[PDB]
Amino acid sequence: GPLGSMKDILSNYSNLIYLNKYVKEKDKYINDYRIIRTLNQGKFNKIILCEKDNKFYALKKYEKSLLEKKRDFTKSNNDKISIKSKYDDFKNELQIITDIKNEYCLTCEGIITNYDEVYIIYEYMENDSILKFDEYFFVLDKNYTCFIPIQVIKCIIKSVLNSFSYIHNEKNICHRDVKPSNILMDKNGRVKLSDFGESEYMVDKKIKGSRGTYEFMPPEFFSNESSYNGAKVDIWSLGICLYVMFYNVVPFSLKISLVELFNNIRTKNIEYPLDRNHFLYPLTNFLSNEDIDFLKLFLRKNPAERITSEDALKHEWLADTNIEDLREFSKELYKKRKKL
């Protein structure tokens, strides 16, 4: 429940490496991993692009001394308050990173540490996340629109559903923050679920309560319930990703304000126009009945009535998934990147 020190957590990890930073002719290295540049400066962690041998890697750096300040207010149990730190959250994440091994999930290849700074080694998914965000979602560039083709969307969903199978059924983990920025693609058309920073071990398939990214949170969270089926939470969020992949915009969600976001999620019907509709004005092809059908199975506001991952994978809509559409898509995308 409340885990021990980092050392304890990692004591049974069989690829824990001693931290060794150094310079060799003004290129900075982490343990043979040559630091190229940083890919993403988060508020806390941060991912680093590196090279070792001839392969490419993304190392995620956390630091104890940094996240152990930044304390918040959890629940209570005892009503005698509760005091948690972002380092406490990371311990739980660490244990998970240590447990995940699957072709459909980003899995680390080693942990480098001094028990303060921590570098988790990951393969580098050269096509980054399936969509990118700033004021809205885009594929490659904020300037030309372009929506992901359906046949490719099919592949991605089937892929992430497969990773649900692993975490939910094999590992008993609820991902708890399934969003576009967390589905990574490589050049060859592999798609992987990543960032388990919000992930928790379920108790009888139930998850703790209310945590993740607001606009991806299910109606359940706005009830009296207090417990929710982990799987259905991740299903809902994939549904949103699906909606986002269709429209390049998040459904009822959107900025300013969040009361208006939350009075919405629990009760309100999602609008299903044609690809560009919420998007014709920022820039100053389109779907078909079946596409909206499938997607609506994910966004049943009542969770016991929401689609299973099993039913999903075996639904008619995915029965014509051709992995070659994704491989071709991913290949051309990679060719369009590093051209910028």
Ligand X SMILES: Nc1ncnc2c1ncn2[C@@H]1O[C@H](COP(=O)(O)OP(=O)(O)NP(=O)(O)O)[C@@H](O)[C@H]1O
Residue ranges in 130-169 that form contacts with ligand X under rule CB under 6 A: none
Least distance CB 313 / ligand X (angstroms)? 25
Q: Does 184 engage in binding with ligand X (CB under 6 A)? A: yes
Three-class secondary structure of residue 114 per DSSP: coil
Known catalytic membership, residue 8: no
**Pure H helices in the chain:** 6-10, 64-67, 86-97, 150-164, 230-247, 259-265, 289-298, 309-313, 323-336
Shorter beta-carbon distance to ligand X: residue 60 or 306? 60
d(CA 206, CA 137): 31
Q: What are the distances in angstroms from CA 161 to CA 24, 72, 130, 289?
A: 44, 33, 15, 22
Q: Does 195 engage in binding with ligand X (CB under 6 A)? A: yes
Least distance CB 13 / ligand X (angstroms)? 19
d(CA 207, CA 226): 9
Q: Does 72 engage in binding with its own copies (CB under 8 A)? A: yes
d(CA 153, CA 147): 10
**Which residue reads 């700074």 in tokens?**
117
Q: Does 96 engage in binding with ligand X (CB under 6 A)? A: no
d(CA 6, CA 114): 10
Least distance CB 182 / Mn ion (angstroms)? 5
Q: Does 124 engage in binding with ligand X (CB under 6 A)? A: yes
One-letter amino acid identity for 122?
Y
Q: Does 212 engage in binding with ligand X (CB under 6 A)? A: no
Shorter beta-carbon distance to ligand X: residue 45 or 264? 45
Binding residues for ligand X, total number by CB under 6 A: 19
Check residue 171 and report its DSSP letter. S
Question: Of residues 30, 50, 58, 112, which one binds ligand X by CB under 6 A?
Answer: 58
For its own copies, what does the binding mask look like between residues 247 and 286, x meaning CB under 8 A?
Answer: -------xxxxxxx-xx--------------x--xx----
Question: Of residues 125, 178, 231, 312, which one binds ligand X by CB under 6 A?
Answer: 125
Q: Are 241 and 178 in contact (CB under 8 A)?
A: yes
Question: Of residues 190, 206, 211, 276, which one binds its own copies by CB under 8 A?
Answer: 211
Structure tokens at 281: 């004005």
260 binds, among Mn ion, its own copies, ligand X, none (CB under 5 to 8 A by kind): its own copies
| Catalytic residue, candidates 128, 177, 234, 291 | 177
d(CA 239, CA 180): 11
What number of other Cβ atoms are within 10 A of residue 92's Cβ?
Answer: 18
Q: What are the distances in angstroms from CA 217 to CA 1, 40, 59, 213, 301?
A: 24, 24, 28, 7, 11
**Which residue reads 């009503």 in tokens?**
79
Residue ranges in 152-191 that form contacts with Mn ion under rule CB under 5 A: 182
For Mn ion, what does the binding mask look like between residues 190 and 229, x meaning CB under 5 A?
Answer: -----x----------------------------------
Least distance CB 7 / its own copies (angstroms)? 24
Structure tokens at 70: 């930044």
- How do 16-18 and 110-113 pair as beta strands? parallel
Residue ranges in 78-137 that form contacts with its own copies under rule CB under 8 A: 81, 83, 135
Shorter beta-carbon distance to Mn ion: residue 46 or 301? 46
Q: Are 25 and 16 in contact (CB under 8 A)?
A: no
Active site residues: 177
Q: Which residues sit at the interface with ligand X, rule CB under 6 A? A: 39-40, 42, 45, 47, 58, 60, 106, 122, 124-125, 128-129, 181-182, 184, 194-195, 197
Q: Which residues sit at the interface with its own copies, rule CB under 8 A? A: 70-73, 81, 83, 135, 210-212, 214, 217, 221-222, 254-260, 262-263, 278, 281-282
